[PDB]
Amino acid sequence: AGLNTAAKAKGLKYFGSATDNPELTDSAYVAQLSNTDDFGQITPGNSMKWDATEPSQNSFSFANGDAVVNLANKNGQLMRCHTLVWHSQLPNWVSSGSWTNATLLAAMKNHITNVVTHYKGKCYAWDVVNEALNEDGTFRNSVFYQIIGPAYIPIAFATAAAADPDVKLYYNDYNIEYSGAKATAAQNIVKMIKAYGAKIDGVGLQAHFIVGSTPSQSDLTTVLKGYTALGVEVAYTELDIRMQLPSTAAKLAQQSTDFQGVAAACVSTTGCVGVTIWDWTDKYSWVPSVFQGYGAPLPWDENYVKKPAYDGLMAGLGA
Numbered sequence: 394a395g396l397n398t399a400a401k402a403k404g405l406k407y408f409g410s411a412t413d414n415p416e417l418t419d420s421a422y423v424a425q426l427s428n429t430d431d432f433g434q435i436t437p438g439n440s441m442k443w444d445a446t447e448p449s450q451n452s453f454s455f456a457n458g459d460a461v462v463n464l465a466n467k468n469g470q471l472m473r474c475h476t477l478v479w480h481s482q483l484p485n486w487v488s489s490g491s492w493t494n495a496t497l498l499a500a501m502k503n504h505i506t507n508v509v510t511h512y513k514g515k516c517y518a519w520d521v522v523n524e525a526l527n528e529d530g531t532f533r534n535s536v537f538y539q540i541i542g543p544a545y546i547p548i549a550f551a552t553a554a555a556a557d558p559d560v561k562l563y564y565n566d567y568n569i570e571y572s573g574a575k576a577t578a579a580q581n582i583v584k585m586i587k588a589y590g591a592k593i594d595g596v597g598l599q600a601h602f603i604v605g606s607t608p609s610q611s612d613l614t615t616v617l618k619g620y621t622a623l624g625v626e627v628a629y630t631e632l633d634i635r636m637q638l639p640s641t642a643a644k645l646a647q648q649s650t651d652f653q654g655v656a657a658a659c660v661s662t663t664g665c666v667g668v669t670i671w672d673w674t675d676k677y678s679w680v681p682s683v684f685q686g687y688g689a690p691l692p693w694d695e696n697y698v699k700k701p702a703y704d705g706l707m708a709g710l711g712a
């Protein structure tokens with residue numbers, strides 16, 4: 394019937410989509426977001442981030458996050474919860490603070506505990522730490538890394554696990570889907586967290602790819618298996634495949650094969666639990682604002698009509 398029914402028939406837990414609160418006023422959009430043939434899972438694109446949930450220290454704010462949860466609940470969809478510790482979309486109080494390790498650690502742990510406790514029982518997974526790596530596999534020099542050092546990562550995991558022992562704890566990043574230093578370093582994060590004694594259940598592979606420059610099915614699969622070998626699950630968490638504009642029939646067909654290999658790589662790897670696309674319609678993609686000259690990244694176009702990539706996904710899912 395659709396992406397999610399096809400995914401589930403192959404043993405995935407879900408096919409899903411991100412969304413964001415301003416889109417939830419668009420009835421046509423919401424109708425399709427709510428189509429569980431296609432979407433069995435939802436991620437809030439912005440409303441569970443630190444700026445949204447803790448705009449002033451110890452002052453939490455859940456209305457916007459909860460509104461996305463409530464829509465998933467209405468539909469019977471799972472949630473992925475995104476994201477507890479990240480260098481982007483931090484409120485001023487974090488980014489401007491005079492911190493010691495002790496004071497920043499207290500603030501970070503209190504952020505995690507409060508946000509995870511709030512959502513206890515509501516999330517399939519949390520992206521506990523997002524984008525902790527540079528491209529060469531060194532640690533990104535965020536405020537957390539500068540002040541706390543590498544331990545921030547396992548401390549964040551352990552804090553989330555204490556607050557909600559049931560939810561899957563993920564490390565999420567981009568450019569860790571293909572073989573290279575960054576993916577190796579992501580494997581090393583998994584190892585480090587466990588060496589500390591902290592819980593990590595999953596690796597989240599953002600999968601912000603480029604039409605005609607997407608990792609191959611074979612390399613995607615080697616990489617997924619390099620994480621599942623470590624005793625963790627994997628998921629593609631933010632899949633989109635941006636094209637150099639203008640859109641053409643040939644680019645749309647390439648985009649289809651590119652999507653197809655992602656879905657098929659997941660199916661081929663036991664322990665790949667699902668795929669989430671980073672929204673589902675080109676209208677609402679984050680891409681054009683960030684990647685100048687790129688766009689049209691998703692399986693439906695800006696008028697909510699299926700593109701060839703929808704069929705590529707279905708083919709990769711063996712439907």
Ligand SMILES: O[C@@H]1[C@@H](O)[C@H](O[C@@H]2CO[C@H](O)[C@H](O)[C@H]2O)OC[C@H]1O
Nearest residue numbers: 481524567568599600601602603683
């Ligand atoms: O802020 C980050 C973006 O920098 C990131 O950008 C990457 C850059 O390397 C790539 O070409 C990858 O395809 C892009 O997504 O994407 C995630 C975002 O949060």
Ligand SMILES: *[C@@H]1O[C@H](CO)[C@@H](O)[C@H](O)[C@H]1NC(C)=O
Nearest residue numbers: 494495498539540541542544
């Ligand atoms: C911060 O403190 C924790 C002990 O609670 C520790 O694991 C870590 O090394 C410290 N980091 C720095 C840079 O002092």
